[PDB]
Amino acid sequence: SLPMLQVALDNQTMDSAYETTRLIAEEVDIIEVGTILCVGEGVRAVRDLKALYPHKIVLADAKIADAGKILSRMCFEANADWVTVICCADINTAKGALDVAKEFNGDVQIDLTGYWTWEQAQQWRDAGIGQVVYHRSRDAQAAGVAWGEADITAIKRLSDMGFKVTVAGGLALEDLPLFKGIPIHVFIAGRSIRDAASPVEAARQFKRSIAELWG
Amino acid sequence: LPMLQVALDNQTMDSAYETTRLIAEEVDIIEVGTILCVGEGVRAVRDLKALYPHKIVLADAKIADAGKILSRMCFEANADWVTVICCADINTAKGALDVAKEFNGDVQIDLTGYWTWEQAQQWRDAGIGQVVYHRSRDAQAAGVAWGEADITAIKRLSDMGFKVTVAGGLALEDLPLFKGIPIHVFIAGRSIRDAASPVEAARQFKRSIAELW
Numbered sequence A: 001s002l003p004m005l006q007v008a009l010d011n012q013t014m015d016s017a018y019e020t021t022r023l024i025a026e027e028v029d030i031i032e033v034g035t036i037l038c039v040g041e042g043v044r045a046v047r048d049l050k051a052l053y054p055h056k057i058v059l060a061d062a063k064i065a066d067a068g069k070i071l072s073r074m075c076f077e078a079n080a081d082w083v084t085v086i087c088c089a090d091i092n093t094a095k096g097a098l099d100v101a102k103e104f105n106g107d108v109q110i111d112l113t114g115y116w117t118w119e120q121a122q123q124w125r126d127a128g129i130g131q132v133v134y135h136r137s138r139d140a141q142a143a144g145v146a147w148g149e150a151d152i153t154a155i156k157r158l159s160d161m162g163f164k165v166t167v168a169g170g171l172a173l174e175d176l177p178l179f180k181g182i183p184i185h186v187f188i189a190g191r192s193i194r195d196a197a198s199p200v201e202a203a204r205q206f207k208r209s210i211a212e213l214w215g
Numbered sequence B: 001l002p003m004l005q006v007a008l009d010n011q012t013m014d015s016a017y018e019t020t021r022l023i024a025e026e027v028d029i030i031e032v033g034t035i036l037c038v039g040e041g042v043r044a045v046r047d048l049k050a051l052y053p054h055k056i057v058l059a060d061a062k063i064a065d066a067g068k069i070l071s072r073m074c075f076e077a078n079a080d081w082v083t084v085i086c087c088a089d090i091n092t093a094k095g096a097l098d099v100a101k102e103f104n105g106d107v108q109i110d111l112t113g114y115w116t117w118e119q120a121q122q123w124r125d126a127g128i129g130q131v132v133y134h135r136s137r138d139a140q141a142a143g144v145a146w147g148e149a150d151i152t153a154i155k156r157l158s159d160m161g162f163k164v165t166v167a168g169g170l171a172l173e174d175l176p177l178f179k180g181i182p183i184h185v186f187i188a189g190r191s192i193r194d195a196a197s198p199v200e201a202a203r204q205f206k207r208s209i210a211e212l213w
């Protein structure tokens, strides 16, 4: 199978986000309401984007740290398909978000930005979490942290634990070959699509490269 | 004396105002809870500071990454303080703190969930002066109580030089557990908002803090 492409809408306002979606909504598989757009506009962003693009998967990247049931329910009532819970959260937070998700036929991903352990990863699997976002912090990226050997190893180990792994964090087109041969579920691109001279062509380039690399 | 922070974990502004119109003048710090940040977005911060410009307004964003952008959105909305979640890369706390400094605001590391003493030393070396020792609401709902290990950890954080806020389902009866520790702030959300008398609930917290400290 080919890795899917997720666009991150890390825009501060809905009209900024629409400037991207009007160009690339049909060029990508998943539309992410980024954490920045969740904070800028609140959960209406989820409701509105799903109303515009009801045939697409809409992910609310809320990076829930606690109050798993309440915050997941807000996102799902706004018609989210998927929500994110941050890796450090108490296990009951992921569990709570998962129970709500099942009411709505949605799903939960654990976002792996920052500091987590393999013991925690086992708890997620035991709790019934099936997706994780292996995620380089943009702030670490800005401080020179590059994709590398240890990432490939960890991504493979997560996959062998039975998770579908999404990869994210300042991904550029030139980074995709690093991941060749690994059954990546989804690649997320925010800035490398939204900020391109032609977002459409940026998205199509990611799709072509993926098709070549995983074909 | 430890200050009293009310958490506005409400889905909509009008729900938050049901609380604030009762207790805004009864507390020291008004928190835009994470639930309100997600429900309404940063407008919540801008609106509540406009209403209560004399009170400290905390945006409980629990930032996980993009420290500079997300803190700047909160501080442009006139937040005084913002939270960063404990698992965030150290450069996220640093980014948020650099922005905070431009606005004469501050950053707290929220300690909900899994973190390490090595990370705590990193926050200190980065110039972080505030943490929120925080029992997860979901852990609370699964039966996790405040205990001596929490008290030991709070004292340890205080000895490292942090001003410590305590939070997580706090009830009036919990206050004596922390006696003798120079707690900076106690947060109460449910035990004030959902009280039969929110005004009595806030006054009782302040009365008890004044007695104990």
Ligand SMILES: [Mg+2]
Binding pocket: A008, A032, A034, A035, A061
């Ligand atoms: Mg995101």
Ligand SMILES: [Mg+2]
Binding pocket: B007, B031, B033, B034, B060
């Ligand atoms: Mg809070």
